[PDB]
A paper describes a structure:
As the H2A.Z nucleosome with a histone H3 variant, H3.3, at a TSS reportedly has different physical properties from the H2A.Z nucleosome with the canoncal H3.1, we also tested whether the incorporation of H3.3 affects the structure of the H2A.Z molecule in nucleosomes. To do so, we crystallized the homotypic H2A.Z and heterotypic H2A.Z/H2A nucleosomes with H3.3 instead of H3.1, and determined their structures at 2.93 Å and 2.35 Å, respectively. We then found that the H3.3 incorporation minimally affected the H2A.Z L1 loop structures in both the homotypic H2A.Z and heterotypic H2A.Z/H2A nucleosomes. Therefore, we concluded that the H3.3 incorporation does not directly affect the structure and stability of the H2A.Z nucleosome. For the heterotypic H2A.Z/H2A nucleosome with H3.3, the tagged H2A-H2B dimer, H2A.Z.1-H2B dimer and H3.3-H4 tetramer were mixed with the 146 base-pair DNA, in a solution containing 2 M KCl. The diffraction datasets of the heterotypic H2A.Z/H2A nucleosomes with H3.1 or H3.3 were collected with an X-ray wavelength of 1.1 Å at −173°C on the BL-1A beamline at the Photon Factory (Tsukuba, Japan). The Ramachandran plot of the heterotypic H2A.Z/H2A nucleosome with H3.3 showed 98.1% of the residues in the favoured region, 1.9% of the residues in the allowed region and no outlying residues.
In the nucleosome, two copies each of histones H2A, H2B, H3 and H4 form the histone octamer, which wraps about 150 base-pairs of DNA on its surface. Among the histone variants, H2A.Z is known as a universal nucleosome component and has been suggested to function as a regulator of transcription. H2A.Z is known to accumulate around transcription start sites (TSSs), which frequently contain nucleosome-depleted regions (NDRs), especially in transcriptionally active genes. Intriguingly, in mouse trophoblast stem cells, the H2A.Z nucleosomes around TSS regions convert from homotypic (H2A.Z/H2A.Z) to heterotypic (H2A.Z/H2A) after DNA replication.
Residue numbers in the entry:
A (entry chain G): 16 to 119
B (entry chain B): 25 to 102
C (entry chain H): 34 to 124
D (entry chain C): 11 to 118
E (entry chain A): 38 to 134
F (entry chain D): 32 to 124
G (entry chain E): 38 to 135
H (entry chain F): 19 to 101
Write the structure that this text describes.
DNA sequence: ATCAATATCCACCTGCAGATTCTACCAAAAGTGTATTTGGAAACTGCTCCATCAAAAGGCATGTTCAGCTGAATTCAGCTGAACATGCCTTTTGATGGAGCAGTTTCCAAATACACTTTTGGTAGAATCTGCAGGTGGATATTGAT
DNA sequence: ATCAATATCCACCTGCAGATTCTACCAAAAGTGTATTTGGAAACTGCTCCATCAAAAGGCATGTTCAGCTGAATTCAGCTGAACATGCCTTTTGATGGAGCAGTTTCCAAATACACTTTTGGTAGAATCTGCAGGTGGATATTGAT
């Protein structure tokens, strides 16, 4: 007692993130005392935001565990998460959409 | 080996892409497109491998290669 | 070999105590956290250098967040960041 | 002590090895920088500069101009497959475009 | 007997494969393809199983995304059938060609 | 106040490839943006390479690999030649 | 009374403007637009002359590049006339809007 | 001092037509001009928003060329010729 | 839409097999207690250079008229691509056993950092230098109507 | 085919705004010295990888119909291009006025440094359950037809 993540009321590691910031910002560079805390809070927020939407879909499909598919549905189903993450979600598939001109 | 990428395989990819009807010329065209994509990715992935003085292409080499061309892939270490 | 698995799992129990997560889905979350961290740190690094600073502060992180996050995400992220720093600087 | 010999001249370069070395050092790209790293980088930057200038210079001549303008730089880059690829997401100010009219648009 | 009209099974396959997440290319042909391409740079490289997996996930995600834009080009031309001209247009807009 | 630029070096290279040809100020500004851009790309890629391989030193080897990644083909071969030549000439005291 | 047929002058204009590099949008009206947009973010902002010029070079290059893709979409639909539909397709494949 | 309004309409029809010509466009629908103005404003909003963000971070009240250049690079629209 | 008639989904289930979660080391690393240094904020201050005005010329936007030809429907059939059943097999699965090549230590000669002290290549500003922008022309297409 | 009307190509001209060259001061590379890391170069690991291989299990290739899609062809309403006069407003240039970059100096709040101890998280097996296999009984949903 007491860890820096605890004092900031976070689950994400302030200490590790501080060290990561201290990496490619060399010893010739510097890192603020609260920069790690602030950075940790953002990562935890975004993680929670993604996990909540994904967790919903997993239960909406009556499944206990979150799968890559649930993550894909949660991201592409959210306008802002979709624009933020233009990465490829492995094993996530695509959102089911058929063009209206294709249906008889 | 590019012919190993079969017509029903290419077809399944088109279905997931929401394609209803497929021209016969598509399959050869798709094989050509896929090859160029793979060439570019593998060229960079092997380059990362040689720099590390390794003879084994790791998943991280691929991820780094995909990231460099703006094709970020999640779920393989990086 | 480091990972964010433990912390992602801890956050998951906050928002969904009843829900678990597959191994492959965890690898995606790991890739996600690493990606976002690199984006923010990289932008924060450039922000400091553009202004001839050698120190990355929470002010650089905040601006980087405003540049990288699209709208409502940005507002809440900035709020969570400020909230966490304020609680940190208290003790 | 010995007479000053610039690292550029030692490398047979026109681009400043010392300045490049300083820029590598204050960009905090790494904790340490090798002795040959700014030499190699300065050489690459010099060659690529030469490549664009050569082709831009050519374009100026066929336009019978003795002074290179942005238009010549654009004509040089977009007409070269590898420079166009390298600068595919780059805007050249006052460069205009390459003349190109789709055949179907032309008269009968 | 029974015979589905052209388009019915096609629409069915779309729903089935958009609903699932499994790889659509057989593993061995893709693995063999990767090695041949790689050997033109470096002969007999060792490949991690996850390395080939990453390449295939990316390859299929790429092609599926391309078929989507390819489909849009076909629809735009008031067609339901995708053609090489549709792929060529999509890749041109992307800056791939 | 002094503002550094690559202008004098680009102009020196200009006289080497086209001794008769000059260059406008706006075209020189483009060349400066180009040099700064390529520098930023190469240095950034070499930085990540060192980080990926857990090295604290960016050497000419990192620069070379970065070049082979960023330059498309014949440009890569020719740049590697100029890079290697300059290094070998430099290491020859 | 001489009169060129529809399309003749249009093709004539294409070759003229593809040959030149000058800005096609008037400087002063573009300046107002930039200042109007920016001051909607931060009141009483000042601008370096080169800052506005940079935005215009980037803006025109972007629109010209978009009209290229837009044109290809029109030709693809066997038309010679570009339409909003063509722009929307081009920007969609670009990933700008979907 | 003076109020800036409706300046997107300052992007005239002949100006948009000229841009299309350089883009190789031969014939233009009437609805294009309003669409082009819409597309342009969204583009300018996005670039200037980031540029001003760089300005505000620098504690400046003057947008520099570099602020714009940085903003353009971040969006994958690298511009040469302005420092 | 009935009416009936196949072909497929598709959610009420189940039972292990295999993923997840849980466990327990224990080295890595975060945290701590001090001691020391230092980047950078802050308070001026000089001096670009930015905002706004003014006018005056004339380039060019605007609004109009009008018909050429294009986009939009529409029709039709030649032919291509979908649906299908049927054999053949390429891929898939699964050990067995080598092994090649990861990654891991522990030494020093080579390499790099960082300061001091001098030197000189690089810049700002002034002084020169001079393409070519912008003007003027015939010559040579190109175009569209008899 | 011919011409008339128009535009573009291309060469001419010069002077001045823009580009180049010159001039010295000085910021910052260069030379030289320590002090400090570092990355090979040995000598050693257990590990995913390669290779069959042995069949075998779904999965592709193949040929035959025919449904219906694509492309050609036709028609016409009306929109968009071309050409024109009109005169507004952009362009150009210069002026002020001064907001506010950018330079500069001081000196602490905020960083790094260091030698430790405490805490944590990565790891691999055991211990735990959760879906993935399938598998229907049963409406969808499609299809030919009255
Ligand atoms: Cl801070
Ligand atoms: Cl080196
Ligand atoms: Cl085609
Ligand atoms: Cl439309
Ligand atoms: Mn030459
Ligand atoms: Mn306003
Ligand atoms: Mn100081
Ligand atoms: Mn038509
Ligand atoms: Mn028929
Ligand atoms: Mn000198
Ligand atoms: Mn002229
Ligand atoms: Mn001094
Ligand atoms: Mn100390
Ligand atoms: Mn623990």
């Amino acid at each position: 007692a007491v860890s820096r993540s605890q004092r900031a009321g976070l689950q994400f590691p302030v200490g590790r993130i501080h060290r990561h910031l201290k990496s490619r910002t060399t010893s010739h560079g510097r890192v603020g005392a609260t920069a790690a805390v602030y950075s940790a809070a953002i990562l935890e927020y975004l993680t929670a935001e993604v996990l909540e939407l994904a967790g919903n879909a997993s239960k909406d499909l009556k499944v206990k565990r979150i799968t890559p598919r649930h993550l894909q549905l949660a991201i592409r189903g959210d306008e802002e998460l979709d624009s933020l993450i233009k990465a490829t979600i492995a094993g996530g598939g695509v959102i089911p959409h058929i063009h209206k001109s294709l249906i008889g | 080996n590019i012919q190993g990428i079969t017509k029903p395989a290419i077809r399944r990819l088109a279905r997931r892409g929401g394609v209803k009807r497929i021209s016969g010329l598509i399959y050869e065209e798709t094989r050509g497109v896929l090859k160029v994509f793979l060439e570019n990715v593998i060229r960079d992935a092997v380059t990362y491998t040689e720099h590390a003085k390794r003879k084994t292409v790791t998943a991280m080499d691929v991820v780094y290669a995909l990231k460099r061309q703006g094709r970020t892939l999640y779920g393989f270490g990086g | 070999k480091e990972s964010y698995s433990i912390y992602v799992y801890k956050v998951l129990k906050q928002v969904h105590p009843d829900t678990g997560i597959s191994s492959k889905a965890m690898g995606i979350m790991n890739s996600f956290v690493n990606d976002i961290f690199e984006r923010i740190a990289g932008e924060a690094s450039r922000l400091a250098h553009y202004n001839k600073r050698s120190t990355i502060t929470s002010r650089e992180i905040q601006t980087a967040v405003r540049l990288l996050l699209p709208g409502e995400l940005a507002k809440h992220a900035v709020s969570e960041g400020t909230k966490a720093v304020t609680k940190y600087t208290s003790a | 002590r010995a007479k000053a010999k610039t690292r550029s001249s030692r490398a047979g370069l026109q681009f400043p090895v010392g300045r490049v070395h300083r820029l590598l050092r204050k960009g905090n790209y790494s904790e340490r920088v090798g002795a040959g790293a700014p030499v190699y980088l300065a050489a690459v930057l010099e060659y690529l500069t030469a490549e664009i200038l050569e082709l831009a210079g050519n374009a100026a001549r066929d336009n019978k101009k003795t002074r290179i303008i942005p238009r010549h730089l654009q004509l040089a880059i977009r007409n070269d497959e590898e420079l166009n690829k390298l600068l595919g997401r780059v805007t050249i100010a006052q460069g205009g475009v390459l003349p190109n009219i789709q055949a179907v648009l032309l008269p009968k | 007997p029974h015979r589905y009209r052209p388009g019915t099974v096609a629409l069915r396959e779309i729903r089935r494969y958009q609903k699932s997440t499994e790889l659509l290319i057989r593993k061995l042909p893709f693995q063999r393809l990767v090695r041949e391409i790689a050997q033109d740079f470096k002969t007999d490289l060792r490949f991690q199983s996850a390395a080939i997996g990453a390449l295939q996930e990316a390859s299929e995600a790429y092609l599926v995304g391309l078929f989507e834009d390819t489909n849009l080009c076909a629809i735009h031309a008031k067609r339901v059938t995708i053609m090489p001209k549709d792929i060529q247009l999509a890749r041109r807009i992307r800056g791939e060609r």
